[PDB]
Design a protein around this nucleic acid. Sequence first.
DNA 1: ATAATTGTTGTCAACAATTAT
DNA 2: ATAATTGTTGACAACAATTAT
Lengths: 145, 145
Amino acid sequence: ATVFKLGLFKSLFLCSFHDITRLFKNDKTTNQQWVLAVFGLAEVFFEASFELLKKQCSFLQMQKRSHEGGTCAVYLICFNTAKSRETVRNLMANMLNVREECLMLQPPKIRGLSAALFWFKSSLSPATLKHGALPEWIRAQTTLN
Amino acid sequence: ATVFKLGLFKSLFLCSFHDITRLFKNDKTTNQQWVLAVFGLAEVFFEASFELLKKQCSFLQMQKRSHEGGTCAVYLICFNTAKSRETVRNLMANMLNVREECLMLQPPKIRGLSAALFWFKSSLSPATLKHGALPEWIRAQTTLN
DNA sequence: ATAATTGTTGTCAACAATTAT
DNA sequence: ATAATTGTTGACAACAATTAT
C-alpha cells in the first residue's frame, strides 16, 4: 500500500516524497528534523497539531492539500529534542489521531537545491502554517551568495 | 480550585461545581470516573479532545458554554483504566493545550439526585457531545423505580 | 562523517498493597 | 466502605556509547 501512498503524495505536491528526504533505515536513529506525510487527516486535528507542536519545536511548517482521490499533509518539524522514528511515530500517530500505517517519517534532505526550494515555495503560500525562523540549510540554499 | 473557576462555572452551568463532585484530597488516588472543568479552552481542541478520549473511554459527555467574562467546558469521563489526578491532570493539560492551573479535577458525585440530573439534563441538549451507554449510577437515579 | 545498533537513565502511567477515616 | 498513602512494575522518551558504512 506504500505504493499508493507515495503516488498520492507526488500527485498532490507535484514532487516525489524522496526528493525532499534522506534515508533512515533504522527506526531507532535519533534526530531533531523530520519530514512527515500524513493521510486521511481530519481538518480539526491538523489545526490542533500545529499549536501543540509549537511548544516543543524550534521551527515548524505545515501544508495540507486534497482532492477526490484522497487527502494529505506534510510536516517539516524541528523538535527541540532529538527523537527516534518510533518516538515521533508514537507522538504524532496519537496527536493526529491516525493509525501508524498512515505515516511516512524520513529526515529532510538538507543538502539539495530542488528540495530546499520546496520548503521555500510553501513558506510563500498563505495556506501554509509557519512558526520559527527558517532552518539554516534552507535559507542558505535559497539566497544569492 | 480558585474562586474564579467556581464562581465562573456556577455562573455558566447554574450550579456549584461541588454539587456534582465528591472530594479526593490526594492527587494520587486512582479512579475511572472523573469530572473536568476547563477554562479558556479553544473550540478546536474541544472538538479534538472528544475523538481522542473515545479511544480510551467507556462513557463520555462533553458540554461547553461561555460569555463576555470567560468560557468553560465540563467533562464526565469514564476511562477504561483507573487514573490518578496527576495522570489525568497531565493527559488533559496537554490534550486540551491549557496550563494545569486551568483545570479542576474531582470524581463525580455518584450518590445524589440533584447531581445525577445535571448529567441527564445535559444528555438532552444537542449541543452536548455524548458517547457510550449512560453510567449505571445515573440511569438508576433518574428512572421511575 | 553519517547512521545503524546497543545500552543506560529518568519519568510516568498501570496497578498492588496498606493504613486511616 | 471510601480514599488517603506508600510502594512495585512496565512502557517509553531523553540520551550516552560503540560499531559500521
